[PDB]
Protein backbone atom coordinates (compact mmCIF):
# COMPACT_ATOMS: atom_id res chain seq x y z
CA UNK A 1 0.00 0.00 0.00
CA UNK A 2 2.93 2.29 -0.82
CA UNK A 3 2.18 5.80 0.52
CA UNK A 4 -0.50 7.81 -1.25
CA UNK A 5 -0.17 11.49 -2.06
CA UNK A 6 -2.95 13.68 -3.37
CA UNK A 7 -3.67 17.39 -3.68
CA UNK A 8 -6.97 19.08 -4.41
CA UNK A 9 -7.31 22.30 -6.30
CA UNK A 10 -9.88 24.73 -7.70
CA UNK A 11 -9.52 24.80 -11.47
CA UNK A 12 -8.16 22.24 -13.94
CA UNK A 13 -5.09 24.10 -15.25
CA UNK A 14 -3.71 24.29 -11.71
CA UNK A 15 -4.36 20.58 -11.05
CA UNK A 16 -2.40 19.59 -14.14
CA UNK A 17 0.60 21.68 -13.06
CA UNK A 18 0.38 20.13 -9.63
CA UNK A 19 0.41 16.70 -11.24
CA UNK A 20 3.29 17.55 -13.52
CA UNK A 21 5.29 18.57 -10.46
CA UNK A 22 4.67 15.64 -8.14
CA UNK A 23 5.49 13.14 -10.89
CA UNK A 24 8.76 15.03 -11.63
CA UNK A 25 9.90 15.95 -8.10
CA UNK A 26 10.01 12.32 -7.01
CA UNK A 27 9.69 8.65 -7.96
CA UNK A 28 5.91 8.74 -7.77
CA UNK A 29 3.29 7.35 -10.15
CA UNK A 30 0.36 9.59 -11.01
CA UNK A 31 -2.51 7.14 -10.44
CA UNK A 32 -5.38 9.43 -11.35
CA UNK A 33 -7.34 12.65 -10.98
CA UNK A 34 -10.66 12.91 -9.15
CA UNK A 35 -13.51 15.39 -9.74
CA UNK A 36 -15.71 16.15 -6.69
CA UNK A 37 -17.72 18.81 -8.46
CA UNK A 38 -17.75 22.59 -7.88
CA UNK A 39 -14.44 23.41 -9.62
CA UNK A 40 -12.68 20.96 -7.22
CA UNK A 41 -10.23 18.37 -8.54
CA UNK A 42 -7.65 16.12 -6.84
CA UNK A 43 -4.49 14.54 -8.24
CA UNK A 44 -3.22 11.30 -6.75
CA UNK A 45 0.25 9.79 -6.86
CA UNK A 46 1.92 6.71 -5.36
CA UNK A 47 5.45 5.89 -4.20
CA UNK A 48 7.48 5.78 -1.01
CA UNK A 49 6.60 7.97 1.92
CA UNK A 50 9.48 10.41 1.41
CA UNK A 51 8.99 10.16 -2.34
CA UNK A 52 5.29 10.86 -2.11
CA UNK A 53 6.20 13.70 0.25
CA UNK A 54 8.85 15.46 -1.82
CA UNK A 55 6.38 15.47 -4.71
CA UNK A 56 3.26 16.61 -2.87
CA UNK A 57 5.57 19.29 -1.66
CA UNK A 58 6.70 20.65 -5.03
CA UNK A 59 3.26 20.07 -6.53
CA UNK A 60 1.73 22.59 -4.12
CA UNK A 61 4.25 25.35 -4.90
CA UNK A 62 3.90 24.91 -8.64
CA UNK A 63 0.12 24.83 -8.49
CA UNK A 64 -0.12 28.11 -6.58
CA UNK A 65 2.19 29.86 -8.99
CA UNK A 66 -0.33 29.10 -11.79
CA UNK A 67 -2.45 31.90 -13.31
CA UNK A 68 -5.37 30.96 -11.07
CA UNK A 69 -3.85 28.17 -9.05
CA UNK A 70 -5.81 27.48 -5.90
CA UNK A 71 -4.63 24.47 -3.86
CA UNK A 72 -7.79 23.50 -1.93
CA UNK A 73 -6.70 20.52 0.17
CA UNK A 74 -3.71 18.24 0.65
CA UNK A 75 -2.89 14.94 2.24
CA UNK A 76 -0.77 11.80 2.29
CA UNK A 77 -1.25 8.51 4.14
CA UNK A 78 2.09 6.72 4.53
CA UNK A 79 0.85 3.16 4.77
CA UNK A 80 -2.81 3.55 3.76
CA UNK A 81 -5.02 0.53 4.59
CA UNK A 82 -5.72 -1.97 1.76
CA UNK A 83 -9.53 -2.14 1.84
CA UNK A 84 -9.29 1.60 1.10
CA UNK A 85 -7.61 0.84 -2.25
CA UNK A 86 -10.55 -1.20 -3.49
CA UNK A 87 -13.10 1.51 -2.83
CA UNK A 88 -11.33 4.71 -3.73
CA UNK A 89 -9.53 5.79 -6.92
CA UNK A 90 -6.09 5.62 -5.31
CA UNK A 91 -5.03 2.75 -7.64
CA UNK A 92 -4.17 1.96 -11.31
CA UNK A 93 -6.46 2.22 -14.38
CA UNK A 94 -6.04 1.30 -18.11
CA UNK A 95 -6.32 -2.46 -17.49
CA UNK A 96 -10.08 -3.28 -17.48
CA UNK A 97 -10.57 -0.40 -19.97
CA UNK A 98 -11.27 -2.70 -22.92
CA UNK A 99 -14.13 -4.26 -21.03
CA UNK A 100 -15.69 -0.93 -19.90
CA UNK A 101 -15.75 0.55 -23.36
CA UNK B 1 -28.61 -5.59 7.34
CA UNK B 2 -25.61 -5.14 9.62
CA UNK B 3 -25.42 -1.48 10.72
CA UNK B 4 -24.46 1.10 8.11
CA UNK B 5 -22.08 3.97 8.78
CA UNK B 6 -21.42 6.84 6.44
CA UNK B 7 -19.89 10.30 6.60
CA UNK B 8 -20.14 13.09 4.08
CA UNK B 9 -17.44 15.63 3.45
CA UNK B 10 -16.55 18.61 1.27
CA UNK B 11 -13.50 17.67 -0.78
CA UNK B 12 -12.05 14.30 -1.85
CA UNK B 13 -8.78 14.25 0.13
CA UNK B 14 -10.75 14.56 3.38
CA UNK B 15 -13.20 11.78 2.38
CA UNK B 16 -10.35 9.37 1.74
CA UNK B 17 -8.80 10.04 5.16
CA UNK B 18 -12.21 9.54 6.70
CA UNK B 19 -12.49 6.21 4.90
CA UNK B 20 -9.01 5.14 5.91
CA UNK B 21 -9.95 5.79 9.53
CA UNK B 22 -13.31 4.04 9.73
CA UNK B 23 -11.93 0.90 8.08
CA UNK B 24 -8.99 0.88 10.55
CA UNK B 25 -10.73 1.95 13.81
CA UNK B 26 -13.09 -1.03 13.65
CA UNK B 27 -14.14 -4.26 11.93
CA UNK B 28 -16.04 -2.41 9.21
CA UNK B 29 -16.06 -2.95 5.45
CA UNK B 30 -15.82 0.14 3.27
CA UNK B 31 -18.69 -0.52 0.83
CA UNK B 32 -18.35 2.54 -1.34
CA UNK B 33 -18.13 6.29 -1.80
CA UNK B 34 -21.00 8.42 -3.11
CA UNK B 35 -20.80 11.70 -5.00
CA UNK B 36 -23.81 14.04 -4.61
CA UNK B 37 -22.23 16.89 -6.57
CA UNK B 38 -21.04 20.28 -5.30
CA UNK B 39 -17.81 19.13 -3.65
CA UNK B 40 -19.86 16.73 -1.49
CA UNK B 41 -18.85 13.07 -1.08
CA UNK B 42 -19.93 10.34 1.36
CA UNK B 43 -18.05 7.25 2.51
CA UNK B 44 -20.00 4.18 3.58
CA UNK B 45 -18.93 1.28 5.77
CA UNK B 46 -20.66 -1.83 7.19
CA UNK B 47 -20.23 -3.85 10.36
CA UNK B 48 -21.79 -4.24 13.80
CA UNK B 49 -23.48 -1.30 15.44
CA UNK B 50 -20.62 -0.62 17.90
CA UNK B 51 -18.09 -1.43 15.19
CA UNK B 52 -19.72 0.92 12.72
CA UNK B 53 -19.85 3.48 15.54
CA UNK B 54 -16.24 3.34 16.72
CA UNK B 55 -15.20 3.84 13.11
CA UNK B 56 -17.57 6.65 12.11
CA UNK B 57 -16.23 8.21 15.26
CA UNK B 58 -12.52 8.12 14.43
CA UNK B 59 -13.25 8.85 10.76
CA UNK B 60 -14.71 12.26 11.68
CA UNK B 61 -11.73 13.32 13.79
CA UNK B 62 -9.20 12.29 11.13
CA UNK B 63 -11.13 13.97 8.32
CA UNK B 64 -11.29 17.32 10.14
CA UNK B 65 -7.57 17.27 10.84
CA UNK B 66 -6.97 17.15 7.05
CA UNK B 67 -5.58 20.23 5.23
CA UNK B 68 -9.09 21.20 4.15
CA UNK B 69 -11.14 18.53 5.83
CA UNK B 70 -14.77 19.52 6.11
CA UNK B 71 -17.09 16.86 7.52
CA UNK B 72 -20.49 17.87 6.07
CA UNK B 73 -22.88 15.20 7.42
CA UNK B 74 -22.82 11.98 9.40
CA UNK B 75 -25.11 9.10 10.19
CA UNK B 76 -25.54 5.43 11.05
CA UNK B 77 -28.63 3.22 11.02
CA UNK B 78 -28.13 0.24 13.33
CA UNK B 79 -30.47 -2.22 11.67
CA UNK B 80 -31.24 -0.44 8.37
CA UNK B 81 -34.25 -1.86 6.48
CA UNK B 82 -33.52 -4.33 3.62
CA UNK B 83 -35.45 -2.73 0.72
CA UNK B 84 -33.15 0.24 1.38
CA UNK B 85 -30.14 -1.92 0.43
CA UNK B 86 -31.46 -2.59 -3.03
CA UNK B 87 -32.00 1.05 -3.88
CA UNK B 88 -29.04 2.80 -2.30
CA UNK B 89 -25.28 2.25 -2.64
CA UNK B 90 -24.97 0.89 0.90
CA UNK B 91 -23.95 -2.59 -0.42
CA UNK B 92 -21.09 -4.45 -2.20
CA UNK B 93 -19.69 -3.84 -5.73
CA UNK B 94 -17.05 -5.65 -7.91
CA UNK B 95 -19.30 -8.64 -8.67
CA UNK B 96 -21.44 -7.63 -11.70
CA UNK B 97 -18.52 -5.46 -12.87
CA UNK B 98 -17.63 -7.76 -15.78
CA UNK B 99 -21.13 -7.40 -17.15
CA UNK B 100 -21.26 -3.56 -16.84
CA UNK B 101 -17.97 -2.99 -18.60
CA UNK C 1 -51.38 6.25 -9.27
CA UNK C 2 -51.24 5.53 -5.54
CA UNK C 3 -50.04 8.68 -3.72
CA UNK C 4 -46.41 9.66 -4.11
CA UNK C 5 -44.24 10.86 -1.25
CA UNK C 6 -40.79 12.35 -1.66
CA UNK C 7 -38.36 14.41 0.44
CA UNK C 8 -35.27 16.24 -0.72
CA UNK C 9 -32.23 16.76 1.40
CA UNK C 10 -28.73 18.20 1.33
CA UNK C 11 -26.25 15.37 1.82
CA UNK C 12 -26.49 11.62 1.19
CA UNK C 13 -26.33 10.26 4.76
CA UNK C 14 -29.42 12.29 5.69
CA UNK C 15 -31.33 11.10 2.60
CA UNK C 16 -30.73 7.48 3.50
CA UNK C 17 -32.05 7.96 7.03
CA UNK C 18 -35.05 9.73 5.58
CA UNK C 19 -35.64 6.72 3.31
CA UNK C 20 -35.18 4.24 6.10
CA UNK C 21 -37.85 6.10 8.05
CA UNK C 22 -40.58 6.49 5.42
CA UNK C 23 -40.32 2.83 4.45
CA UNK C 24 -40.63 1.82 8.13
CA UNK C 25 -43.22 4.33 9.39
CA UNK C 26 -45.78 3.15 6.88
CA UNK C 27 -46.77 0.66 4.15
CA UNK C 28 -44.83 2.57 1.52
CA UNK C 29 -42.47 1.31 -1.18
CA UNK C 30 -39.24 3.22 -1.68
CA UNK C 31 -39.30 3.63 -5.48
CA UNK C 32 -36.04 5.47 -5.90
CA UNK C 33 -33.67 8.32 -5.08
CA UNK C 34 -33.05 11.29 -7.38
CA UNK C 35 -29.93 13.43 -7.66
CA UNK C 36 -30.47 17.03 -8.87
CA UNK C 37 -26.89 18.06 -8.32
CA UNK C 38 -25.43 20.48 -5.77
CA UNK C 39 -25.61 18.19 -2.74
CA UNK C 40 -29.37 17.82 -3.32
CA UNK C 41 -31.03 14.38 -3.32
CA UNK C 42 -34.66 13.26 -3.13
CA UNK C 43 -36.15 9.99 -1.87
CA UNK C 44 -39.45 8.79 -3.29
CA UNK C 45 -41.97 6.37 -1.86
CA UNK C 46 -45.41 5.05 -2.90
CA UNK C 47 -48.46 3.84 -1.02
CA UNK C 48 -51.83 5.15 0.15
CA UNK C 49 -52.31 8.84 0.87
CA UNK C 50 -52.31 8.43 4.68
CA UNK C 51 -49.56 5.80 4.40
CA UNK C 52 -47.41 8.03 2.20
CA UNK C 53 -48.13 10.84 4.69
CA UNK C 54 -47.26 9.06 7.92
CA UNK C 55 -43.94 8.09 6.35
CA UNK C 56 -42.98 11.44 4.78
CA UNK C 57 -43.72 12.73 8.25
CA UNK C 58 -41.35 10.47 10.22
CA UNK C 59 -38.77 10.62 7.43
CA UNK C 60 -38.40 14.39 7.95
CA UNK C 61 -37.86 14.15 11.71
CA UNK C 62 -35.29 11.36 11.37
CA UNK C 63 -33.40 13.14 8.59
CA UNK C 64 -33.01 16.36 10.58
CA UNK C 65 -31.70 14.48 13.60
CA UNK C 66 -28.82 13.20 11.45
CA UNK C 67 -25.28 14.59 11.99
CA UNK C 68 -25.73 17.03 9.12
CA UNK C 69 -29.30 16.28 8.12
CA UNK C 70 -30.76 19.07 6.03
CA UNK C 71 -34.26 18.45 4.69
CA UNK C 72 -34.39 20.76 1.64
CA UNK C 73 -37.90 20.19 0.22
CA UNK C 74 -40.92 17.99 0.76
CA UNK C 75 -44.06 16.99 -1.10
CA UNK C 76 -46.77 14.44 -1.75
CA UNK C 77 -49.40 14.23 -4.50
CA UNK C 78 -52.31 12.08 -3.37
CA UNK C 79 -53.56 10.96 -6.74
CA UNK C 80 -50.72 12.08 -9.02
CA UNK C 81 -51.58 12.10 -12.76
CA UNK C 82 -50.47 9.06 -14.81
CA UNK C 83 -48.60 10.74 -17.67
CA UNK C 84 -46.41 12.05 -14.85
CA UNK C 85 -45.35 8.51 -13.99
CA UNK C 86 -43.91 7.88 -17.43
CA UNK C 87 -41.72 10.94 -17.43
CA UNK C 88 -40.47 11.14 -13.86
CA UNK C 89 -38.67 8.62 -11.65
CA UNK C 90 -41.70 8.13 -9.41
CA UNK C 91 -42.05 4.45 -10.51
CA UNK C 92 -40.36 1.01 -10.23
CA UNK C 93 -36.89 -0.03 -11.50
CA UNK C 94 -34.99 -3.38 -11.61
CA UNK C 95 -37.10 -4.79 -14.46
CA UNK C 96 -35.51 -3.49 -17.71
CA UNK C 97 -32.12 -3.58 -15.93
CA UNK C 98 -30.84 -6.59 -17.87
CA UNK C 99 -31.38 -4.73 -21.12
CA UNK C 100 -29.71 -1.45 -20.00
CA UNK C 101 -26.56 -3.16 -18.77
CA UNK D 1 -44.84 22.34 -33.56
CA UNK D 2 -47.74 22.65 -31.12
CA UNK D 3 -46.82 25.22 -28.43
CA UNK D 4 -44.20 24.22 -25.89
CA UNK D 5 -44.50 24.92 -22.18
CA UNK D 6 -41.73 24.43 -19.64
CA UNK D 7 -40.92 25.57 -16.11
CA UNK D 8 -37.63 25.34 -14.31
CA UNK D 9 -37.28 24.87 -10.60
CA UNK D 10 -34.73 24.42 -7.84
CA UNK D 11 -35.26 20.99 -6.31
CA UNK D 12 -36.81 17.78 -7.65
CA UNK D 13 -39.88 17.49 -5.43
CA UNK D 14 -41.08 20.90 -6.63
CA UNK D 15 -40.51 20.02 -10.31
CA UNK D 16 -42.65 16.90 -10.00
CA UNK D 17 -45.54 18.86 -8.48
CA UNK D 18 -45.15 21.39 -11.25
CA UNK D 19 -45.38 18.57 -13.75
CA UNK D 20 -48.35 16.98 -12.07
CA UNK D 21 -50.18 20.29 -12.32
CA UNK D 22 -49.51 21.25 -15.96
CA UNK D 23 -50.52 17.80 -17.18
CA UNK D 24 -53.78 18.03 -15.12
CA UNK D 25 -54.72 21.71 -15.64
CA UNK D 26 -54.85 21.28 -19.41
CA UNK D 27 -54.70 18.94 -22.42
CA UNK D 28 -50.91 18.94 -22.41
CA UNK D 29 -48.45 16.07 -22.77
CA UNK D 30 -45.50 16.00 -20.40
CA UNK D 31 -42.66 15.42 -22.88
CA UNK D 32 -39.80 15.28 -20.43
CA UNK D 33 -37.72 16.78 -17.66
CA UNK D 34 -34.31 18.39 -18.13
CA UNK D 35 -31.45 18.63 -15.65
CA UNK D 36 -29.08 21.60 -16.16
CA UNK D 37 -27.14 20.93 -12.98
CA UNK D 38 -26.94 22.94 -9.74
CA UNK D 39 -30.30 21.90 -8.33
CA UNK D 40 -31.99 23.20 -11.50
CA UNK D 41 -34.57 21.11 -13.37
CA UNK D 42 -37.13 21.94 -16.09
CA UNK D 43 -40.39 20.22 -16.96
CA UNK D 44 -41.69 20.41 -20.50
CA UNK D 45 -45.20 19.91 -21.84
CA UNK D 46 -46.85 20.16 -25.26
CA UNK D 47 -50.33 21.08 -26.47
CA UNK D 48 -52.22 24.10 -27.81
CA UNK D 49 -51.12 27.61 -26.95
CA UNK D 50 -53.98 28.24 -24.48
CA UNK D 51 -53.70 24.67 -23.23
CA UNK D 52 -49.95 24.95 -22.72
CA UNK D 53 -50.67 28.28 -21.00
CA UNK D 54 -53.37 27.23 -18.57
CA UNK D 55 -51.05 24.45 -17.45
CA UNK D 56 -47.80 26.39 -17.13
CA UNK D 57 -49.95 28.72 -15.09
CA UNK D 58 -51.25 26.22 -12.51
CA UNK D 59 -47.92 24.42 -12.52
CA UNK D 60 -46.20 27.52 -11.15
CA UNK D 61 -48.68 28.03 -8.30
CA UNK D 62 -48.51 24.37 -7.24
CA UNK D 63 -44.71 24.25 -7.37
CA UNK D 64 -44.31 27.31 -5.12
CA UNK D 65 -46.70 25.90 -2.53
CA UNK D 66 -44.33 22.92 -2.17
CA UNK D 67 -42.23 22.52 1.03
CA UNK D 68 -39.24 24.02 -0.75
CA UNK D 69 -40.74 24.84 -4.12
CA UNK D 70 -38.62 27.37 -5.97
CA UNK D 71 -39.77 28.14 -9.52
CA UNK D 72 -36.55 29.36 -11.18
CA UNK D 73 -37.62 30.16 -14.79
CA UNK D 74 -40.65 29.89 -17.04
CA UNK D 75 -41.46 30.07 -20.71
CA UNK D 76 -43.66 29.03 -23.60
CA UNK D 77 -43.19 29.38 -27.35
CA UNK D 78 -46.53 29.24 -29.13
CA UNK D 79 -45.37 28.00 -32.51
CA UNK D 80 -41.77 27.00 -31.76
CA UNK D 81 -39.58 26.48 -34.88
CA UNK D 82 -39.10 22.86 -36.07
CA UNK D 83 -35.30 22.63 -36.29
CA UNK D 84 -35.47 23.46 -32.58
CA UNK D 85 -37.34 20.18 -31.94
CA UNK D 86 -34.52 18.09 -33.33
CA UNK D 87 -31.88 19.63 -31.12
CA UNK D 88 -33.64 20.13 -27.81
CA UNK D 89 -35.54 17.72 -25.54
CA UNK D 90 -38.88 19.33 -26.32
CA UNK D 91 -40.13 16.11 -28.03
CA UNK D 92 -41.20 12.48 -27.32
CA UNK D 93 -39.08 9.64 -25.89
CA UNK D 94 -39.71 5.87 -25.27
CA UNK D 95 -39.49 4.95 -28.96
CA UNK D 96 -35.76 4.42 -29.74
CA UNK D 97 -35.31 3.23 -26.13
CA UNK D 98 -34.81 -0.41 -27.08
CA UNK D 99 -31.89 0.56 -29.29
CA UNK D 100 -30.18 2.81 -26.67
CA UNK D 101 -30.29 0.21 -23.94
CA UNK E 1 -16.07 26.77 -41.02
CA UNK E 2 -19.09 29.02 -41.59
CA UNK E 3 -19.37 31.49 -38.66
CA UNK E 4 -20.41 30.11 -35.29
CA UNK E 5 -22.89 31.84 -33.01
CA UNK E 6 -23.60 30.82 -29.43
CA UNK E 7 -25.21 32.33 -26.35
CA UNK E 8 -25.05 31.13 -22.77
CA UNK E 9 -27.80 31.56 -20.27
CA UNK E 10 -28.79 30.72 -16.73
CA UNK E 11 -31.81 28.45 -16.83
CA UNK E 12 -33.18 26.10 -19.50
CA UNK E 13 -36.42 27.85 -20.44
CA UNK E 14 -34.47 30.95 -21.39
CA UNK E 15 -31.96 28.96 -23.48
CA UNK E 16 -34.75 27.39 -25.52
CA UNK E 17 -36.30 30.80 -26.30
CA UNK E 18 -32.86 32.02 -27.28
CA UNK E 19 -32.52 29.08 -29.61
CA UNK E 20 -35.96 29.54 -31.05
CA UNK E 21 -35.02 33.11 -31.91
CA UNK E 22 -31.61 32.65 -33.54
CA UNK E 23 -32.93 29.86 -35.77
CA UNK E 24 -35.88 32.09 -36.85
CA UNK E 25 -34.17 35.52 -37.11
CA UNK E 26 -31.70 34.20 -39.70
CA UNK E 27 -30.59 31.36 -41.98
CA UNK E 28 -28.74 29.62 -39.15
CA UNK E 29 -28.68 25.96 -38.13
CA UNK E 30 -29.02 25.18 -34.45
CA UNK E 31 -26.14 22.73 -34.03
CA UNK E 32 -26.57 21.97 -30.35
CA UNK E 33 -26.85 23.03 -26.74
CA UNK E 34 -24.07 22.70 -24.17
CA UNK E 35 -24.37 22.25 -20.41
CA UNK E 36 -21.40 23.55 -18.35
CA UNK E 37 -23.05 22.91 -15.02
CA UNK E 38 -24.32 25.39 -12.43
CA UNK E 39 -27.51 26.39 -14.26
CA UNK E 40 -25.39 27.46 -17.25
CA UNK E 41 -26.34 26.37 -20.79
CA UNK E 42 -25.21 27.53 -24.24
CA UNK E 43 -26.99 27.34 -27.59
CA UNK E 44 -24.95 27.12 -30.77
CA UNK E 45 -25.93 27.96 -34.33
CA UNK E 46 -24.12 28.04 -37.70
CA UNK E 47 -24.51 30.09 -40.86
CA UNK E 48 -22.97 33.17 -42.51
CA UNK E 49 -21.32 35.86 -40.44
CA UNK E 50 -24.18 38.36 -40.86
CA UNK E 51 -26.69 35.52 -40.59
CA UNK E 52 -25.12 34.20 -37.40
CA UNK E 53 -25.10 37.80 -36.19
CA UNK E 54 -28.69 38.80 -36.85
CA UNK E 55 -29.74 35.65 -34.99
CA UNK E 56 -27.44 35.90 -31.96
CA UNK E 57 -28.85 39.39 -31.82
CA UNK E 58 -32.54 38.55 -31.65
CA UNK E 59 -31.82 35.52 -29.51
CA UNK E 60 -30.46 37.72 -26.74
CA UNK E 61 -33.45 40.04 -26.67
CA UNK E 62 -35.93 37.16 -26.63
CA UNK E 63 -34.04 35.28 -23.93
CA UNK E 64 -34.01 38.30 -21.55
CA UNK E 65 -37.72 38.86 -21.98
CA UNK E 66 -38.33 35.35 -20.57
CA UNK E 67 -39.78 34.89 -17.06
CA UNK E 68 -36.31 34.34 -15.64
CA UNK E 69 -34.20 34.83 -18.72
CA UNK E 70 -30.58 35.47 -17.84
CA UNK E 71 -28.19 35.71 -20.81
CA UNK E 72 -24.83 34.86 -19.20
CA UNK E 73 -22.35 35.08 -22.11
CA UNK E 74 -22.31 35.62 -25.86
CA UNK E 75 -19.96 35.19 -28.77
CA UNK E 76 -19.43 34.53 -32.45
CA UNK E 77 -16.32 33.64 -34.40
CA UNK E 78 -16.72 34.58 -38.07
CA UNK E 79 -14.31 32.10 -39.60
CA UNK E 80 -13.60 29.79 -36.64
CA UNK E 81 -10.54 27.52 -37.11
CA UNK E 82 -11.22 23.92 -38.23
CA UNK E 83 -9.31 21.94 -35.58
CA UNK E 84 -11.71 23.69 -33.19
CA UNK E 85 -14.65 21.93 -34.85
CA UNK E 86 -13.30 18.49 -34.05
CA UNK E 87 -12.86 19.17 -30.37
CA UNK E 88 -15.87 21.29 -29.48
CA UNK E 89 -19.62 20.71 -29.94
CA UNK E 90 -19.90 23.40 -32.59
CA UNK E 91 -20.82 20.79 -35.27
CA UNK E 92 -23.63 18.39 -36.34
CA UNK E 93 -25.03 15.37 -34.42
CA UNK E 94 -27.62 12.63 -35.26
CA UNK E 95 -25.29 10.76 -37.65
CA UNK E 96 -23.17 8.40 -35.47
CA UNK E 97 -26.16 8.16 -33.08
CA UNK E 98 -27.01 4.57 -34.03
CA UNK E 99 -23.53 3.48 -33.07
CA UNK E 100 -23.50 5.31 -29.68
CA UNK E 101 -26.80 3.89 -28.55
CA UNK F 1 5.58 15.36 -24.64
CA UNK F 2 5.52 18.56 -26.70
CA UNK F 3 4.57 21.49 -24.41
CA UNK F 4 1.01 21.64 -23.13
CA UNK F 5 -1.01 24.85 -22.97
CA UNK F 6 -4.37 25.18 -21.29
CA UNK F 7 -6.60 27.98 -20.03
CA UNK F 8 -9.58 27.75 -17.74
CA UNK F 9 -12.56 30.06 -17.92
CA UNK F 10 -15.97 30.68 -16.38
CA UNK F 11 -18.59 30.22 -19.06
CA UNK F 12 -18.60 28.23 -22.32
CA UNK F 13 -18.76 31.05 -24.89
CA UNK F 14 -15.53 32.49 -23.50
CA UNK F 15 -13.77 29.09 -23.54
CA UNK F 16 -14.58 28.62 -27.23
CA UNK F 17 -13.15 32.04 -28.16
CA UNK F 18 -10.05 31.20 -26.15
CA UNK F 19 -9.75 27.97 -28.07
CA UNK F 20 -10.31 29.68 -31.38
CA UNK F 21 -7.45 32.03 -30.56
CA UNK F 22 -4.80 29.61 -29.33
CA UNK F 23 -5.31 27.34 -32.36
CA UNK F 24 -4.97 30.40 -34.70
CA UNK F 25 -2.18 32.38 -32.98
CA UNK F 26 0.26 29.46 -33.27
CA UNK F 27 0.98 25.95 -34.60
CA UNK F 28 -0.89 24.30 -31.75
CA UNK F 29 -3.38 21.42 -31.79
CA UNK F 30 -6.49 21.83 -29.69
CA UNK F 31 -6.51 18.47 -27.88
CA UNK F 32 -9.68 18.94 -25.88
CA UNK F 33 -11.82 20.85 -23.40
CA UNK F 34 -12.31 19.84 -19.76
CA UNK F 35 -15.29 20.50 -17.51
CA UNK F 36 -14.54 20.71 -13.75
CA UNK F 37 -18.03 21.78 -12.81
CA UNK F 38 -19.26 25.12 -11.45
CA UNK F 39 -19.16 27.06 -14.70
CA UNK F 40 -15.45 26.20 -15.00
CA UNK F 41 -13.99 24.85 -18.29
CA UNK F 42 -10.44 24.48 -19.60
CA UNK F 43 -9.14 24.35 -23.16
CA UNK F 44 -5.98 22.40 -23.91
CA UNK F 45 -3.59 22.71 -26.84
CA UNK F 46 -0.26 21.09 -27.83
CA UNK F 47 2.75 22.22 -29.83
CA UNK F 48 6.20 23.70 -29.19
CA UNK F 49 6.96 25.69 -26.07
CA UNK F 50 6.99 29.05 -27.86
CA UNK F 51 4.10 27.94 -30.05
CA UNK F 52 2.07 26.83 -27.07
CA UNK F 53 3.02 30.14 -25.46
CA UNK F 54 2.12 32.56 -28.24
CA UNK F 55 -1.30 30.87 -28.37
CA UNK F 56 -2.07 30.72 -24.65
CA UNK F 57 -1.17 34.36 -24.80
CA UNK F 58 -3.65 35.47 -27.48
CA UNK F 59 -6.28 33.08 -26.19
CA UNK F 60 -6.39 34.97 -22.87
CA UNK F 61 -6.84 38.38 -24.46
CA UNK F 62 -9.59 37.16 -26.79
CA UNK F 63 -11.42 35.33 -24.02
CA UNK F 64 -11.54 38.40 -21.77
CA UNK F 65 -12.90 40.57 -24.55
CA UNK F 66 -15.92 38.23 -24.74
CA UNK F 67 -19.37 39.38 -23.52
CA UNK F 68 -18.82 37.60 -20.21
CA UNK F 69 -15.33 36.26 -20.71
CA UNK F 70 -13.75 35.29 -17.42
CA UNK F 71 -10.32 33.65 -17.68
CA UNK F 72 -10.12 31.67 -14.41
CA UNK F 73 -6.69 29.94 -14.60
CA UNK F 74 -3.79 29.49 -16.98
CA UNK F 75 -0.77 27.31 -17.36
CA UNK F 76 1.74 25.59 -19.63
CA UNK F 77 4.25 22.83 -18.94
CA UNK F 78 7.06 22.95 -21.49
CA UNK F 79 8.14 19.32 -21.35
CA UNK F 80 5.33 17.75 -19.32
CA UNK F 81 6.13 14.28 -17.94
CA UNK F 82 4.76 11.29 -19.93
CA UNK F 83 2.91 9.34 -17.23
CA UNK F 84 0.88 12.57 -16.93
CA UNK F 85 -0.36 12.07 -20.49
CA UNK F 86 -1.94 8.72 -19.70
CA UNK F 87 -3.93 9.98 -16.76
CA UNK F 88 -5.07 13.44 -17.84
CA UNK F 89 -6.99 14.65 -20.92
CA UNK F 90 -3.93 16.40 -22.35
CA UNK F 91 -3.86 14.00 -25.37
CA UNK F 92 -5.76 13.06 -28.58
CA UNK F 93 -9.32 11.66 -28.89
CA UNK F 94 -11.44 10.38 -31.86
CA UNK F 95 -9.50 7.12 -32.21
CA UNK F 96 -11.09 4.64 -29.74
CA UNK F 97 -14.42 6.45 -30.28
CA UNK F 98 -15.98 3.60 -32.27
CA UNK F 99 -15.40 1.23 -29.38
CA UNK F 100 -16.80 3.57 -26.68
CA UNK F 101 -20.02 4.24 -28.55
Curated annotation (Swiss-Prot), chains A, B, C, D, E, F:
Sequence ranges assigned to domain BMC in this UniProt record: 3-89
Any GO MF annotation of the entry: structural constituent of carboxysome shell
GO CC field: carboxysome
Species of provenance: Synechocystis sp. (strain ATCC 27184 / PCC 6803 / Kazusa)
Family, per entry: Belongs to the bacterial microcompartments protein family. CcmK subfamily.
Entry's localization field: Carboxysome
Domain remark from Swiss-Prot or TrEMBL: The tight homohexamer forms a pore with an opening of about 5.9 Angstroms in diameter which is positively charged. The C-terminal flexible tail, which is the most variable part of CcmK proteins, seems to be involved in packing of hexamers in layers.
Pfam assignment, any one: BMC
Protein name per UniProt: Carboxysome shell protein CcmK2
PANTHER family (UniProt xref): CARBOXYSOME SHELL PROTEIN CCMK4, PROPANEDIOL UTILIZATION PROTEIN PDUA
Amino acid sequence: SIAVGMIETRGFPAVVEAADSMVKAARVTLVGYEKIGSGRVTVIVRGDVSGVQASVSAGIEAANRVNGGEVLSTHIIARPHENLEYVLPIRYTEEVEQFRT
